[PDB]
Structure formats: C-alpha cells, structure tokens
Design a protein around this ligand. Sequence first.
Ligand SMILES: Nc1ncnc2c1ncn2[C@@H]1O[C@H](COP(=O)(O)OP(=O)(O)O)[C@@H](O)[C@H]1O
Ligand SMILES: Nc1ncnc2c1ncn2[C@@H]1O[C@H](COP(=O)(O)OP(=O)(O)O)[C@@H](O)[C@H]1O
Ligand SMILES: Nc1ncnc2c1ncn2[C@@H]1O[C@H](COP(=O)(O)OP(=O)(O)O)[C@@H](O)[C@H]1O
Ligand SMILES: Nc1ncnc2c1ncn2[C@@H]1O[C@H](COP(=O)(O)OP(=O)(O)O)[C@@H](O)[C@H]1O
Ligand SMILES: [Mg+2]
Ligand SMILES: [Mg+2]
Ligand SMILES: [Mg+2]
Ligand SMILES: [Mg+2]
Lengths: 441, 426, 433, 443, 49
Amino acid sequence: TRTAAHTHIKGLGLDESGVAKRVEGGFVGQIEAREACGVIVDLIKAKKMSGRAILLAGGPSTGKTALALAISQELGPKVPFCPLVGSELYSVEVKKTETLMENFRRAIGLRIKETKEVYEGEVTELTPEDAENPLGGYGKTISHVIVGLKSAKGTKTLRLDPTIYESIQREKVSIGDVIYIEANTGAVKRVRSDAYATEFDLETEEYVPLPKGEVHKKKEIVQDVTLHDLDVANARPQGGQDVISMMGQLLKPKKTEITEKLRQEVNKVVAKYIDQGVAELIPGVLFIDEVNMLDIEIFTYLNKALESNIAPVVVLASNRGMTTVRGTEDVISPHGVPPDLIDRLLIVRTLPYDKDEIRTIIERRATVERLQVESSALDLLATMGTETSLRYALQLLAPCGILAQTSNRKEIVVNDVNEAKLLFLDAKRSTKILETSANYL
Amino acid sequence: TRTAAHTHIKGLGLDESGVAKRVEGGFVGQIEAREACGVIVDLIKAKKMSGRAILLAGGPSTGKTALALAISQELGPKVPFCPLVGSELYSVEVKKTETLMENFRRAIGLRIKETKEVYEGEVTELTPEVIVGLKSAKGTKTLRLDPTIYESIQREKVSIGDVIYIEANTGAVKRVGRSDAYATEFDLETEEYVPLPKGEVHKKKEIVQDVTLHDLDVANARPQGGQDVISMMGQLLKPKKTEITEKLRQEVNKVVAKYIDQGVAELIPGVLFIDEVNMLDIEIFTYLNKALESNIAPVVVLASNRGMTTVRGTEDVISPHGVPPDLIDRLLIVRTLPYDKDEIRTIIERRATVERLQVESSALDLLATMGTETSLRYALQLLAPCGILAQTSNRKEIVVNDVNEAKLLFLDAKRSTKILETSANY
Amino acid sequence: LKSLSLIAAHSHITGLGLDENLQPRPTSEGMVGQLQARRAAGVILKMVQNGTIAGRAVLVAGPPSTGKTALAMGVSQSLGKDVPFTAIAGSEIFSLELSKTEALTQAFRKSIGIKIKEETELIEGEVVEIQIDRSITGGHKQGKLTIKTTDMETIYELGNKMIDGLTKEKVLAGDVISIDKASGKITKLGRSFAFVQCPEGELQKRKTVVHTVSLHEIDVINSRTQGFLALFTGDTGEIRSEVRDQINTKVAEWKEEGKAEIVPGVLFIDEVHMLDIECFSFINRALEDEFAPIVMMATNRGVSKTRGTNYKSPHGLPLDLLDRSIIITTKSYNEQEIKTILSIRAQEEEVELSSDALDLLTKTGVETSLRYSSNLISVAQQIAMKRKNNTVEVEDVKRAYLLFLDSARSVKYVQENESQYIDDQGNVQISIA
Amino acid sequence: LKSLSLIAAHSHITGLGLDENLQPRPTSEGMVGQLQARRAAGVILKMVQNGTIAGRAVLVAGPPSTGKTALAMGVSQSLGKDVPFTAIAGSEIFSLELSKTEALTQAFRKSIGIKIKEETELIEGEVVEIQIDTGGHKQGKLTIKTTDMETIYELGNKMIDGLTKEKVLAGDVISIDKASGKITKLGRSFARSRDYDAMGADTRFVQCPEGELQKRKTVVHTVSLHEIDVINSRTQGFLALFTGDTGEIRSEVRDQINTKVAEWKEEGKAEIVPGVLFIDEVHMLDIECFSFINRALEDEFAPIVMMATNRGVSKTRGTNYKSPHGLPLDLLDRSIIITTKSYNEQEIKTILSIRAQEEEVELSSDALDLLTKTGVETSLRYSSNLISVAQQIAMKRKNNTVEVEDVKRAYLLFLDSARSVKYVQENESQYIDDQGNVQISIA
Amino acid sequence: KLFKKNNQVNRVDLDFLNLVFTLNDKDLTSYHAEEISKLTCVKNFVEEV
Ligand SMILES: Nc1ncnc2c1ncn2[C@@H]1O[C@H](COP(=O)(O)OP(=O)(O)O)[C@@H](O)[C@H]1O
Ligand SMILES: Nc1ncnc2c1ncn2[C@@H]1O[C@H](COP(=O)(O)OP(=O)(O)O)[C@@H](O)[C@H]1O
Ligand SMILES: Nc1ncnc2c1ncn2[C@@H]1O[C@H](COP(=O)(O)OP(=O)(O)O)[C@@H](O)[C@H]1O
Ligand SMILES: Nc1ncnc2c1ncn2[C@@H]1O[C@H](COP(=O)(O)OP(=O)(O)O)[C@@H](O)[C@H]1O
Ligand SMILES: [Mg+2]
Ligand SMILES: [Mg+2]
Ligand SMILES: [Mg+2]
Ligand SMILES: [Mg+2]
C-alpha cells in the first residue's frame, strides 16, 4: 500500500518473438531500448557468456532506473539481482578489491535440492526380538527391532536393525510421542502429544496433535544460496568454549582478508557437487547506476575483471556526456568513462518522449495515486509539463489534489492548479531567484 | 642450482694493505669505491667506535649494491648486515621512528650464554590437586606442575606409556609420544613408539643461543612461553609489536649491561643498509638527523644517486642525491665512476662464466659493443636469452644470428621510445 | 575435477602451439599470429623451466586489445602442472592488514614452492566379520575386526583408542574398508552392496607421498600459533624476519642434503602501467634477491607519469627498471589474423554462424575493435535464435548494429547535442522542447 | 519541560497546527506571516501523515533566522509523538567508521516507524506454601493461594523437580506460566518485610495481586528495525545498541528485514508509521551525497527529506563547476521550493515581545520600538540577545522594566556587526593577516 | 594503597538509585517491571508507620 514514483512500470511491453508496442506494460515508447533489454534478458537466461556490460545514454526520466527495475522484476527469485552505485564502494573498513570480490561471489548462486524419507507416527510399543547368543557367551541377542507407528489414517510398524535400541536408549523415547527414523540412516530423533497435555496442571513439557498422512513420506526442499555464504561460513569461527571461536566472538570479527586458497577449495567442492547432479549453478545480475563518479582505478580493475570465467553479467548506467572523468582530470572523456571502456562495451541510447506519451505517463501516474483531473485542466497540465518537465508535473500533481481535497473537492480544476503553479517554482526559477534577490536569498 | 645476478662476487680482494685486485671475486674497476669500502671494513673490524655513516653515490650498474653485498659477505656469518629500503620503514601498526629503532636494536649482535634444561622421560603417575613422573633411561623423577602447566599437561593426553620433552627454564611441554617400551600394544598402533630418553630426566646442557636487542625486548614485552595454555593467552592478547618506549629502553640497557658484565657475554656491532634515500620524506630525514646524535646508533650505509632534484617530503629543497643539505653536511661521500668498454667486456665475460656460458671471443666482443652502445644492463640481460636461443637454434656457441635475434626481439628503452613517437594510439 | 566456468574470452585459446625450435604456427592451439611474440614466449618458458635463473623482469607493451593478456595466459597455462604459479593485478598491491611492501613481499613469496617426500603405509580389504567386547555404561572394551580380502582370512585387532576410531561410523560385515596404520583414519571405499566387489590382492600396501607447500605458507605456519587461522582468515601482517631467515636456511640445507626438492614458481603482474614509484623501487630491490620468481609486466600507454613521481617516463615505468627489463613489444593484427580470431571465437561459442556473419565480423574488425564484434556475434546469434534457425544472416547483424552503439557513434551523438546530457559545468535537459 | 530543558530561542512556537480551513492567519500560535509557506507546509505535513505514498521531497530556501529550524521543529511538534525525528546536521555525516552513504541509509532506517504486538501468559498471586510428604517428590502437588482461587496444583516430572528449582521458602507471590513455562519471582509479601530488618537487594515485597491467576497479557512495542539489526548483528548483540559500533550495516540484512516487515504487515502483526528526515544547510555537503539521494529517495521505503539551505550561486562540494544554490540540477529538479522573505516591523516587534514573554522579561514601549529598529536594520537575533542583556541590566538596576537606559547601555557596550567591521578596518594595525603581519610595536 | 581511601567518604550508590540500567536488561522483562511499579506506590508500608 505504498508508492514512490513507482508501482506503474512492470515488465517492458515484451512479447514472444521480441516485439515492443506503443502503449502497454507500463512502459510507453522506447521500443528500441525495451527490445534491447528483452534480448539482454534472453541472453541472461541463456547463461552462456560471462561478464558482459551495457551502458545507457539519456537525460532525466528516460527509463534507466525504470528499465533496471523492469529487468530485475523479469529475473524473479530464480536469478538474484543486485542493485548498487559505485559510491557505496567507498568502504572504509576493507579495500575496494575485496568488496568487488564479495559482490562477485554474491552475484554467483547455487541451487540445492534433496529429498529425505520420513517415517512418522506414534510409538505403539517397543519389544525385543530375542535370539540365543551365538558368539562368546550365552543369553540374550536381539535379532532386530520392530516398532509400530500411527499417523492420521496411516498405521505401519517399522522393522529395523536392533542397533536402534541405542537410539531408544539415547533419545529417551518413552512411548508414543515423537518418531524420526529412516530406513538406511536410521536412529530415532525426538522433538509428548496433546492427548496427555491435560494430565498436568502446569509443566514445561511439549505436546503435539496426531501426525497426519501415511507413516512413510518424502519432503522436497529448494534453496538458492550464494557462494559467498559458504565462504563466510568457512571463514567466521563459530563455537563454544574453544578458545578460537569464543575469542573471535569476543573480538567482534571484521572483514578479514580471506585467503584465495579457501575460495578456490570452495569453488572446487561446489563444482564437484554440481556436476554430480545434486546441485547446479545459477548466475546473478549485478547492476550499478550513476557510474560517472567511478574513478580510474576502478575503471582499470573492471577492464581487467571483464574476462573472468565465473564473472556474471554486470549492467551499468549513467547519463553524462562531454565531461572530465571523475577520479582525476587527465582523462576528459565522454560519459565520464575513459575510451578504454567505451570502445570495449555496448552503448545504448535513450531520449525523452513525445507529448502524447508523456501525457499518458502523467495520466497513469494520476490513476495509480487515485486522484484525477478533468480535461479542462489536464490540457493545461500537459502544456505546462511539456514546458517545464515531467518530474515537475508528476510531483506537483499531488499537492494540487491534496489542496483540492482540503478545499472540499475531488477533481482538479483551473483554480487549484493555477495558484499551485503560482506558489511553487522550479530549477530555472531557482536560478532566477539566485540571480535576482539581493538579500542573501 | 639457481643464480640471481649475484654470488659471482666473493669478496673485495683486499691485500694485506687493503688494496683489492683489478678483477677478483667478481669486481671491475672502481678503485675509489673499493678502497673506501676497505677503509670502512677496517674501521668496523676495529670494533671500538660507533655512530658514523657514509653514502656511496653512483649511477645504475655502478656496483653500489654489489659493493654492499661484497662488504656483507666479507664481514662474515656472525656479524650481521641489515638490508633495508626506504619502502620498508613505512610500517602499518607502529610508527616509522619506532621501526627504525627496532632495526637498530636488532642490528647489534650480542653473543650470550644462557642456560636451558629439559625434562624428558616416561610418565609414571600424575596426582591432581602436580606430579609428572618422568622416567628416563636411568632416572625416574616426579616434578610438580603449576596449575597452568598442569592444564597444559592435561591437554597433552599424556598417560602411562608416554614421553614428553618439557623444557625446564621456559617450562613448556612437548610430548615425544607413546613409549617404545609398550610396543606390544597393537600391531598397527597409530601413535609413534619412542623409547625412554637417555641420561637423567633433568638433562642439562650449556647452550650458546645468543640474543639480539629486539629479541630480549620481545622476550618480556610479549612473552612467548609457547606450549602452555597461559602462554597461548599471553601470545594471543598481544601477538603484535607494541610501541616500546624509552623507559623499557633504559631497563633493557641496564639488563644487557649486567648480563655483559656477568663475563661470558660480549658485544659485536653490525651494519645497516638503505637504498634510494631520495624517496624518503623530510620527516624521517629530520628525525634521523637528531637520532644519529646519540651513543647507540650503529653503522648504516646509504646508496642514493640524484641530481638537482627536490627532496621528497619538501617542495623547495633542491640538492644532490635527494638528501637534505644538513645530512649531506654530516655524511661522508664515496664516489663511483661510470664503467668503461674494458670493464663491460670483463663484466660480460665473468657473468658468462658464472652462468656456465662458454661464450667465445667474437660473441663476447659484440656483446661488449651492445653494452657500450645502449647500456650495460641491456647487454647483461641477454647472456641467458642468447645461450638459450642458440640451444634452440642448435648452437653450442653464440653466433651473430643469436645476438641479432635478441636485439630485434628484446628491445631496449631507446628503441621502444623511438617506436613511441609514431603510433596512432599509446 | 573440472572447474566451473562459462564461455570466457580467454576460454578460447590454450597454450601457444610452439615447436621443438619454438617456431610459431600461424594458427595452432588457439593462438593466431604473433610469430615473434610466440618465439619470445617460447624462449621465456624454456628459460623458466631451466631453473638456473631467478629474478628477471620482463615487460610487454602494445596498443589496446592486442592479445597481450592472451599471450600471458597462454604462457601461464603452458607452464604444465604440479608447479605453483601466482598472479596479481594492478590494484591489489594496496592492503590494510599488510603494507604495500609486505603485500608485494607475499606476492613474491607465494610463487616458489618446496616438495617433501615421505613413506606411507595402509591396510585395505573388506570387513566381513566384526566382534567387539563392550560393556554397557563401562570404561573398558576390546575388539576384533576381520578386515579381509578375497585371498586370506585375517582377524585384525584394535589397541586402546582404536575402538572409537574404527567404530566412529557404520562398519558392517561386507564393507570394503581401507584404514591407515599411523592414524587409523576411515576412508569409505564404498559399500559392498545394498556396491563394490570384495577386493583381491594383499591387505597391507606401502607407497610414497610427496607434499607441496609454498615459501610464504612455510613462513606463516611456524612463525606463531594462530597463523593456522591465517592460512584462511589471513589474520597476520609483516611476519617477523627471524622466522623468514630460519626457514630460508632450513630450505637451503634441505636442498643441500636432498630430503626435499624445490619447485620454483612464477609471479605474474599485469596492467602495472599504474603503480607507485615506491613499488617500482620495491621491484628494483626484490629482483636481485637470491630467491626470486620470474616477474612479468604489462602496459597499454606510452609516455606517462608513474604514480609517486612527476616525470612522464616512457612505458609508464622508471628508466632504471626499464633498462633492467626485457621488452617484448606487440603490433596490430592482420585482417587474416582478425578473421581467424573471429572464426575461432565463433567455434568456441559453437554458434553455427553463416559466411556473411563472419564477413561482417571481419568488416567490423577492420573498421573498429574486435571485442565489440565479440558482443555483436552474441546479439546477432540471439536475434537469429528469435527466428529459431541455427544461422545468422545479414538481417540479424544489421539490426543489432543499427540498434546498438560502439564508442565513436555515441561520442558523435553527444558531440552534436552537448547541451542535452550533463556537461562538465553541470547542465542536463529533460524536455525535448 | 519534562526533561532538563531550560528554554529555546523558539520555544513559543510548538506546532504547525493550521486550522481546519488550512487558510493561513496573520497570527497563529505565536508565528506571524509565512502565509503561502505555512499553507504548503500544512499540505506537506498532511501528505506525510497520509502514510501511503513515499518518495516525496520539499526544498527550503531563504536567508536564515526566518524560523526555518523553528519551522521544522513546529512541523515535528504538530506531528505529535510516536514519530521519532532524525536530528542530524550537515557536519554529522562525514564520520570515521560510518561512510556517508550508509550513514544516510541508517538515518532513514531510524526514520521509519513500525508497530509490533505480542501475547504471553502468566500466573499471578501464587502464595504457594509447599508442603509434601527425603527428595524424590512423592505426591508432588503444591498449594496455590491467590486472591480468587485457592487450590492445589498437580505437577509432573518437570515441575516436581522444578519446584525444587528456584529454592524458596514459599511464603511469597510467585509467577508461573500455564503454557509450559518457567518460574519467576516477582517479590516477597509484606509479612516478609518485617522478618528481616534490612532486606537484601534481591528481596522486595509486593502484595498479592487482587484478582485471578491465569493472566493472558498482550504487549505492544514501537522499535525501529535498525534496532533489531543491531540486536541480531552478532550472537549477543545487545551491548551495541548504545555504544555505537554498528559497523556499516550490510544490505543483505536490510533486504531480509524488508521482507520480514512486509510479511508481518501482510500477517497484520506489524503496521507502518510515517517518518521524516531533516538536515539544515544542505549546501555544505558533498556532491556525492546529492547524487546518492537523487536515486535513494525513490525507493519503496523513501521517507520525505526536509531540504533547507540559504547560500547563493556557488559550487557543490566535491566538484569544481558553478552550481545553482550550491546544489546540483538533479537535486534541484525532483523537489519543491520553500522561500522566506525579509522581516517587517510589525512581526519584528511582536516576535520580540513574544520572546520577552518566553524569557519572563518585561519590555516597555521605548525599549520595544528601539529594539525593533535594531532588529530591522540588523537581524532580529541581535535584539533577541539584547532583551536578555537589558533585563539583566534592569534587575541589576533595581527594576524589572526595560527602557532606553538598559538598551542604550547595551548598544554602547555591545557592537553592531557593521560598526565592528568599520572598527576592524580602521584599527587593522593591531590585527594580523594570514602571513602573521602584526604591528606589535606601539610607539 | 595511597589512593583508595576516600571510597566510603563520598560514595553515592548508583546501583541503589537504579542507574546501571544498561546492565539490568539481562534478566528483565517489561510486564513484570510494570506490574511491580503499579503495585509499588506506598499502600503497604505507611499503614503500620
Ligand atoms: N522511459 C520511462 N518509462 C516509464 N517510466 C519512466 C521512464 N523514465 C522515467 N520514468 C519514471 O521516472 C522514475 C525514474 O527516473 P529515471 O529515468 O531513473 O531518471 P534519470 O533519467 O534521471 O535516471 C521511475 O519511477 C519511472 O516511474
Ligand atoms: N664490480 C663488479 N663486479 C661484478 N659485477 C658487478 C660489479 N658491479 C656491479 N655489478 C653487477 O651490476 C649489477 C648492478 O650492480 P648493483 O651494485 O647491484 O646496483 P647498482 O650498481 O646499479 O647500484 C649487479 O647485478 C651486479 O651483479
Ligand atoms: N592473436 C590472438 N589470439 C587469441 N586471442 C586474441 C588474439 N588477439 C586478441 N585476442 C582476444 O582479444 C582480447 C584482447 O586482449 P589482449 O590482447 O590479451 O590484451 P589487451 O586487451 O590488453 O591488448 C583477448 O581477450 C583475446 O581473447
Ligand atoms: N513567525 C515567528 N514567530 C515567532 N518567532 C519567530 C518567528 N519567526 C522567527 N522567529 C524567531 O526567530 C528565530 C529564527 O531562527 P531560525 O530561523 O530557526 O534559525 P536558522 O535560520 O539557523 O534555522 C527563532 O529563534 C524564533 O524565536
Ligand atoms: Mg536507478
Ligand atoms: Mg650499486
Ligand atoms: Mg588481454
Ligand atoms: Mg538554521
């Protein structure tokens, strides 16, 4: 139930065979950009190339963040999407290289799936199956152990090796409370039942209704975890009275420089599990916008890392033109990016919309906000939006509607908008205020 | 075997009067530098004075660092030579001045004779409250464990049938392992079988393990008892180097004075080294300016060569060798001259002999021509490549084809620069 | 065994395809052209496998996108196996737990290695009988495990602590089991069934195992106590030089007597065109060290100011280290070379491009860069896959080209409309009017 | 003045509580004027109170001392309680262990409002007096005697050995959880107050609760999610709530917490509460901050920020080019502008009188008019200090009224800025330039 | 031994005035504290006084 200049851009107006139409799927216009991003999405789903990159070129409110959020939505939970700006890379705690390695390992995922048999029910009995002691000594020798169980509508007794007696000894099964044992792995595990819950006025005992389903069942689990999670689990020492783990916990551990030995071992183990079929790797799209501030060292580092084998696609965004590259003034290059990167990367352009498309944008934003304006005022709204800007009209529509609501109205008529534009100003009027007033204003 | 540009130098070659031969033990010319180095060698061999330093100035491939290694290998094993570069003094967790004094303190050698004893035997019983009944070949004695070393003994899983090498003075315990006497326990026993140690359990020896000043500094600043658990906490709470102040300096001076006056110990000086002091900032220069005005700062050598260049750490101090004027005025200059055609010939000859290259006459002369034409290092770096090229091009000797292939393949700075002024891109 | 990866740019060439005399084939083992560069790589690899020479700086220069890193990785892979080799980049020199001095020191140390041999013994067979005498809630037990092969009947025994070691996990009376003597470690060769047949041969086999370890690893393991955590966490910095000297003399005397064997490695540095002059002097001092891996460099620019200085020294490198380095310059590609590269990249992508696809790829390589073609191939292939055939005609390539942009086109678009996007004085335009 | 608060330069202004008409008044709650500005501020405050739309922005400009900080404080007061206000100045983001970007993120995380509810159960009034008939707990039933029900509770394996836990004399009010929970002491009884003369710190005496025992109690909390982040930062992350060693909170925790709050809101266990951000004099901030906010203020959880500055055509810190207001065009585009105006005589005199009332200071006609002249030729702050100094003079002059005497004494003994600059320019001889140019010599 | 002698001379017990709150949350819950505070105000010890 929240909205911040959003909740109206979903998808890209996509379709099978890659066609983008005029007004559909939230987006309006930018057929070239939307089809290019759809092709990019298909490439990401293919999972063939490593470490590609595409930049953007345009002015304010052209879809850069909108396109990024659209592709992020199109990815879904299957493929992670990591948005970022290079300004967050100013990590005082640890160096830039380690931060980029951590982002890389975060943008690499592995999906694990497995199924374990479960034998459920309630222990109806426990009896020995005696045989005479064959080896040295005589007396008792239990051949095996068979124990009954009953979940809802499913009753079955499990025959099992006699060794499960130790589990019965170890887990203190009592009789008919909780059962967790498998055919091969074996051993019972305990977690009483609500039927006995009223036998005590107050206790600290656990209870549970009767288990449902049949005695034998299976459970399916799917979990997508990044390799960085495994790396940090390996690195961070967790434990108890052992001096290493409790000393680390006392020390408030920081971003220690993990050695590449453990990283490569983790990669080897992950690959050896994945090839066996028990696991499979899925990439993750890292996205960084407003990249003009990124300095020369990061430019060279990304130029080096573009060729990495495990490198996932990283999509970059900016809007600068003929400027001096941030980091140092020696390189005065387009888009605040040295030509070392421009000539080696795919450039995509954007441009603002026409009056019809921008008017549809304003109208749809009004519809999402639930406010509305009649034609006799929306025509002048469109004319002023063309005159001033898109963000100006989009942001100032809400004050007009709220003023009307406080003025006992629901529509937006000529008065409210006239006085609203009379009161507030914009960037050009801001410069005029700067260079007209002579009282420090 | 491996050779890295050195080990061809095997001494200055100074005669009974301190005059070195022309080409002996990897040397070429530079009689001024050799004679000054011999003078400094004699002054150090005097072992009476201290607190004096010199710089030797020379261009690239002029034998400065070569002379430093020569003096190092001339001094001998016990007297240490301290190599250090201006990049080394930039430490991480301690300030540069303290690092310089750590280098100074570890520079001076101090022959000392301290005592160690070790208890080593088969354990017979343990009595918690601690008894460890070590049984050696002829002795069986029961020490008492302090609670900390008792805990260390407990963690050592030592039981009847085990031998431990627990030192007496440090106190730390190192188990030797299961006794070889109980070899009849399992035909495939995992633990190693070690017999009962010879002599008494409390074996005593006279040791000549010496100590540098930094060594006994870290001995009490960060105790390193080692194997005991409390020693583990001692070396874990402060494992790093702490900023030792002048108070501990005076305490250490008193301790070393009393130890050296005990009679058995002695003192020997040392030599420290610095390369390219031009990059050093004005702060370290100013601090060392007041640091050499002391009574403990040992001998250090400077290797730098800069013209009318601004001293790093400043913006207007222009001086030769990148050294501030005060340090130049309080430091002794040794001169080095550029190498000559015959020096280049002999250098390439010796560098071929050490590299097991039987380079013939005309090949050696042409290599000398390249050495005299562009730079000595450019010719020197080609000896192994030309030999390997002739090996691949089935030639025991080095014909002009090999050197021409090297000169068209492995270019010098001049040819690359000639390329660089004609290029559509850098 | 295989390491995970995707279709990488350098996943297209392996080795150099040299000869006995190191003569370069025009196109072999992926590498195309660069004949004298291939010869230099070959002489370098023979020089490093000789093992008699340490500490020689080598630098490579050339225009952007000119296969320098391709040659470097080919050399690195051509180094064979069973020998360590370490590589770094132009921005990993700096550190916080370490100084740049110590970071470069560790980078130099990691390459060289040692290998120590030792004897190993093992028992192997199939547990087909087992009998353990164990009191319930007691503290005294014995056992007899009949680990056997298909050759003889052998009831082995356990000592004091071996019962837990051989009963930590499931041990049955059919299972093929191999255990070691000096440690009692359990290794699951596989269950007999319910699926490996009972083994033949003799139970107890002896062998030899050689363990490898790098110089810096030896320095860090024995210097202190918590350094084992530093093997992974890296919680150490500026190891005391006394331990370094002790391990160095230990290695020297080990090599002298012959207990172990040295396996010298190689250190690799690329894009060193930017680096502090302090690090350059660090290289200048480390090259003549007695133990020194062969060091490579790389550069893209020419006359330029090295970091920490103010003089535009050639090759981005100070003249002192320039002179003491072996320069291997690279020149541009031939059109034959670029079209062969396009073909080998396409077949590495195993994308069945048409002839016109490679024609336009070569035309683009003539007009502009080659990696832009290495992305145009992918976009054209995907647009053709939008038509479902396994071929790419002129239509897909032309559509991809007139929908996407290289450097020059976008540069000119911004040039003619400097007042639209943000300029250096900070003005951008949102409205088309 | 619940806390040790003494007085404010603007304490008379507590709340931008515009009337139901929202039409500005010539005078209201002590403030005068700001008519269109107050109307827009009321609109903004209502929009914030809506709690359904995020990612809004408003900019404030104009010369200082025009109540801008007072404007924000009145907005906060009119917003009531349960809405914590982020009090962060411009010079608080360049921190050492907290980089500016995630510092702004932390400020926003604090700015959010949320509510949480929970339910538990207890037993009240358990004046037990155990008596059983050694060990083993044979026939393990305990007497329980509260105000309403006085019976004997049967126990089991966990209680017959749980009553021997928390070893007590059983003559006190105790609490047990009927939902399989542990035993907790709430204090002894008044009869136990007299048995021991000096009761130990642990022992306190509280009456038996006047009612039944089985109490199902609901609790409500208003804790920001960043506090939960600090709590679950480590295994025991409770010490770090106040110390301040957060450590540049990672974004994985941020998105996990976003998912958790979304799912709890869908479950109804949590509901949101609007928040505001305000920092004064945004001009003296890095261009990186403006670039970051221009993207981070359109996120799903994007509370509005109260931008405010007063500089002119200058350069955004972190760049070189001339910029509007010392702010980038991108930040000067996605917002709306609030401006102030030069003071007039009437509101100057009214504000001076109101301040005198707030300071418990009496001002007569002559002093009020003279100080209005001072505050119109100069700013009003000089007269606001002069009323205080003149009342001090008066109460030292054995009177309470302020007139021409104290005001003139202050004028002679306290210097105007313009005349101070004139004195500086005419006595520069005694002053020092950058190069240490001082004329210490006199004769 | 030359310093720690003015301890009991001018010590004001901060714990007795409940200002060690940061160290009191280890075994504290809100409902119990509020219930005790409600059943704290006089009404139990002034009667016999
Ligand atoms: N092409 C577009 N289509 C739809 N919405 C857009 C488009 N461009 C901008 N917007 C709106 O503007 C917001 C993002 O603006 P953005 O394009 O990122 O500005 P800039 O161009 O300065 O980066 C989104 O919330 C979106 O609703
Ligand atoms: N007198 C000499 N005899 C043999 N080799 C020398 C001599 N002088 C210099 N060299 C060689 O020249 C190289 C440069 O000498 P060195 O003193 O190490 O540095 P530099 O002289 O450039 O300061 C060294 O590798 C050394 O092997
Ligand atoms: N002769 C070649 N053989 C194989 N690959 C090449 C060749 N020339 C260029 N490439 C490819 O083009 C890219 C250019 O990179 P490279 O020439 O290695 O370094 P740089 O980009 O610094 O010149 C490489 O990734 C490589 O895959
Ligand atoms: N409308 C008003 N009514 C009463 N007092 C006011 C009014 N406007 C300003 N003031 C007084 O002027 C001062 C304005 O200071 P302020 O503008 O908050 O400083 P800054 O410009 O640094 O934010 C306040 O202390 C307040 O007492
Ligand atoms: Mg964005
Ligand atoms: Mg030298
Ligand atoms: Mg390359
Ligand atoms: Mg203010």
